[PDB]
Design an enzyme around this catalytic site. Structure first.
Site, PDB file in Angstrom:
ATOM      1  N   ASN A 195       0.811  -1.206   0.000  1.00  0.00           N
ATOM      2  CA  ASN A 195       0.000   0.000   0.000  1.00  0.00           C
ATOM      3  C   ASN A 195       0.854   1.270   0.000  1.00  0.00           C
ATOM      4  OD1 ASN A 195      -2.334   1.411  -0.129  1.00  0.00           O
ATOM      5  ND2 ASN A 195      -2.741   1.386   2.071  1.00  0.00           N
ATOM      6  N   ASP A 254       4.641  -5.714   2.674  1.00  0.00           N
ATOM      7  CA  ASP A 254       3.250  -5.326   3.010  1.00  0.00           C
ATOM      8  C   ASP A 254       2.305  -6.195   2.174  1.00  0.00           C
ATOM      9  OD1 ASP A 254       1.370  -3.345   4.395  1.00  0.00           O
ATOM     10  OD2 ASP A 254       1.016  -2.805   2.308  1.00  0.00           O
ATOM     11  N   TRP A 255       1.286  -5.636   1.522  1.00  0.00           N
ATOM     12  CA  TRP A 255       0.339  -6.441   0.753  1.00  0.00           C
ATOM     13  C   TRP A 255       0.977  -7.085  -0.476  1.00  0.00           C
ATOM     14  CZ3 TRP A 255      -3.987  -8.266   2.509  1.00  0.00           C
ATOM     15  CH2 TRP A 255      -4.595  -7.634   3.611  1.00  0.00           C
ATOM     16  N   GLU A 281       7.635  -6.668   6.592  1.00  0.00           N
ATOM     17  CA  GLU A 281       6.415  -5.922   6.924  1.00  0.00           C
ATOM     18  C   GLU A 281       5.194  -6.559   6.272  1.00  0.00           C
ATOM     19  OE1 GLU A 281       6.548  -3.618   9.172  1.00  0.00           O
ATOM     20  OE2 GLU A 281       8.739  -3.655   9.258  1.00  0.00           O
ATOM     21  N   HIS A 340       8.251   1.175   8.785  1.00  0.00           N
ATOM     22  CA  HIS A 340       7.513   0.340   7.847  1.00  0.00           C
ATOM     23  C   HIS A 340       8.074   0.449   6.432  1.00  0.00           C
ATOM     24  CE1 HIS A 340       3.990  -1.508   5.900  1.00  0.00           C
ATOM     25  NE2 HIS A 340       4.027  -0.478   5.073  1.00  0.00           N
TER      26      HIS A 340
HETATM   27  O1  LIG Z   1      -0.124   3.337  13.295  1.00  0.00           O
HETATM   28  C1  LIG Z   1      -1.006   3.567  12.529  1.00  0.00           C
HETATM   29  N1  LIG Z   1      -0.884   3.799  11.214  1.00  0.00           N
HETATM   30  C2  LIG Z   1       0.349   3.853  10.433  1.00  0.00           C
HETATM   31  C3  LIG Z   1       0.474   2.617   9.565  1.00  0.00           C
HETATM   32  C4  LIG Z   1      -0.455   2.347   8.579  1.00  0.00           C
HETATM   33  C5  LIG Z   1      -0.294   1.209   7.812  1.00  0.00           C
HETATM   34  C6  LIG Z   1       0.783   0.363   8.048  1.00  0.00           C
HETATM   35  O2  LIG Z   1       0.935  -0.799   7.285  1.00  0.00           O
HETATM   36  C7  LIG Z   1       1.702   0.638   9.043  1.00  0.00           C
HETATM   37  C8  LIG Z   1       1.549   1.790   9.805  1.00  0.00           C
HETATM   38  N2  LIG Z   1      -2.139   4.017  10.717  1.00  0.00           N
HETATM   39  C9  LIG Z   1      -3.009   3.892  11.766  1.00  0.00           C
HETATM   40  C10 LIG Z   1      -4.419   4.027  11.809  1.00  0.00           C
HETATM   41  C11 LIG Z   1      -5.187   4.303  10.517  1.00  0.00           C
HETATM   42  C12 LIG Z   1      -5.242   2.927   9.833  1.00  0.00           C
HETATM   43  C13 LIG Z   1      -4.342   2.583   8.834  1.00  0.00           C
HETATM   44  C14 LIG Z   1      -4.385   1.328   8.231  1.00  0.00           C
HETATM   45  C15 LIG Z   1      -5.336   0.401   8.634  1.00  0.00           C
HETATM   46  C16 LIG Z   1      -6.234   0.736   9.643  1.00  0.00           C
HETATM   47  C17 LIG Z   1      -6.185   1.989  10.239  1.00  0.00           C
HETATM   48  N3  LIG Z   1      -5.056   3.872  12.958  1.00  0.00           N
HETATM   49  C18 LIG Z   1      -4.384   3.580  14.070  1.00  0.00           C
HETATM   50  C19 LIG Z   1      -5.119   3.477  15.251  1.00  0.00           C
HETATM   51  C20 LIG Z   1      -6.384   4.058  15.283  1.00  0.00           C
HETATM   52  C21 LIG Z   1      -7.144   4.006  16.455  1.00  0.00           C
HETATM   53  C22 LIG Z   1      -6.629   3.383  17.585  1.00  0.00           C
HETATM   54  O3  LIG Z   1      -7.371   3.320  18.777  1.00  0.00           O
HETATM   55  C23 LIG Z   1      -5.370   2.810  17.549  1.00  0.00           C
HETATM   56  C24 LIG Z   1      -4.604   2.867  16.384  1.00  0.00           C
HETATM   57  C25 LIG Z   1      -2.992   3.465  14.051  1.00  0.00           C
HETATM   58  N4  LIG Z   1      -2.333   3.620  12.846  1.00  0.00           N
END
Ligand SMILES: O=c1n(Cc2ccc(O)cc2)nc2c(Cc3ccccc3)nc(-c3ccc(O)cc3)cn12
Length: 309
Positions: A52, A119-120, A143, A284
């Site tokens: 992604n 990743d994906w 990852e 990441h």
């Molecule tokens: O660290 C992170 N990233 C950074 C990241 C993204 C993708 C990856 O492959 C590695 C790191 N993104 C988030 C998000 C948003 C999101 C992104 C993708 C899928 C589901 C949700 N939401 C949270 C979170 C939200 C509420 C909560 O209570 C706790 C955590 C944390 N996120």
């Protein structure tokens, strides 16, 4: 706080247009795939799969290390980078897989292929491997989507995060605000990208709206058994069981710094036999902080796999 440019990186920077001029296009099904192909040493094939937010561009400083030992092929996944769009506007794992496998058929591949997945992109490699178990020479992953997240393996607030990304608030975060490119990508790189490097990641998703759908659809595929897409949970169940039993398949796992999503990945990867483990200091998107270390690790691994074959 802010991050800082690597003062030595600008010297060797490869802009988007510089990279895109080096790529090729091939029609695939009802669309087309943009890809990089080093062509030489075609007796082996190392297929690098981004995940992604990114594109083939992610591998630009990693791939030169491998080109001398094997043909390297690096696609932009459908709807990403400079590839075509999906015919039905759908960007689920199986949509990506449909275009990827049709592209494979047109590449004059050897019988046994080496995959490098992030990743994906690793999920795509793992699923291909499960469905073509006689076509796999080795798998490098990092990852990666290694396993499902069972109810008892949920870590605090993964429920919250996935509900956020599956909500309309999550849709506007991505479609309107470009969350994965504008926020996640720089937040998971230790250095600050040169402006031209960031522009290369932004360019496919520069316009607001539905063109950003692939970056929303990927996280919504996450194999959280609690409410996760049943077809993807089954796909990951199948290839995880295959990977756990694949004693004769050489693997390389490249570990980075721990993160909110990271801990399940490393513990899942250690369940796969015949895995060589290495580490780089990065987050990441570790290709942007340690491309040469990564490239040298992958090169030694490929060399060992080939010599021992
Ligand atoms: O660290 C992170 N990233 C950074 C990241 C993204 C993708 C990856 O492959 C590695 C790191 N993104 C988030 C998000 C948003 C999101 C992104 C993708 C899928 C589901 C949700 N939401 C949270 C979170 C939200 C509420 C909560 O209570 C706790 C955590 C944390 N996120």
């Amino acid at each position: 706080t802010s991050k800082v440019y690597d003062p030595e990186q600008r010297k060797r920077m490869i802009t988007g247009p510089q990279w895109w001029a080096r790529c090729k296009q091939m029609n695939v099904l009802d669309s087309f795939i943009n890809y990089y192909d080093s062509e030489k040493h075609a007796e082996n094939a190392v297929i690098f799969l981004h995940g992604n937010a990114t594109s083939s561009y992610l591998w630009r400083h990693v791939v030169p290390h491998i080109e001398p030992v094997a043909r390297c092929i690096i696609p932009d996944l459908i709807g990403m980078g400079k590839s075509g769009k999906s015919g039905n506007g759908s960007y689920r794992l199986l949509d990506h897989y449909k275009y990827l496998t049709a592209w494979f058929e047109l590449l004059n591949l050897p019988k046994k292929i080496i995959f490098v997945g992030h990743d994906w992109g690793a999920a795509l490699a793992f699923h291909y491997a499960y469905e073509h178990q006689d076509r796999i020479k080795a798998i490098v992953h990092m990852e990666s989507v290694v396993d499902v997240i069972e109810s008892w393996d949920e870590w605090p607030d993964i429920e919250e995060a996935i509900a956020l990304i599956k909500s309309e608030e999550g849709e506007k975060m991505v479609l309107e605000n470009n969350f994965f490119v504008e926020t996640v990508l720089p937040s998971k790189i230790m250095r600050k990208l040169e402006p031209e490097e960031f522009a290369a990641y932004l360019e496919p998703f520069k316009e607001k709206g539905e063109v950003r759908r692939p970056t929303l659809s990927w996280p919504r595929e996450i194999p959280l058994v609690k409410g996760g897409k049943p077809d993807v949970v089954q796909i990951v169940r199948n290839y995880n069981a295959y990977l756990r039993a694949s004693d004769d398949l050489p693997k390389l796992f490249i570990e980075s710094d721990p993160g909110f999503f990271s801990n399940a990945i490393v513990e899942g990867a250690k369940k796969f036999p015949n895995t060589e483990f290495v580490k780089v200091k990065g987050l990441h998107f570790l290709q942007e902080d340690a491309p040469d270390e990564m490239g040298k690790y992958i090169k030694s691994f490929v060399e060992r796999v080939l010599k021992n074959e």
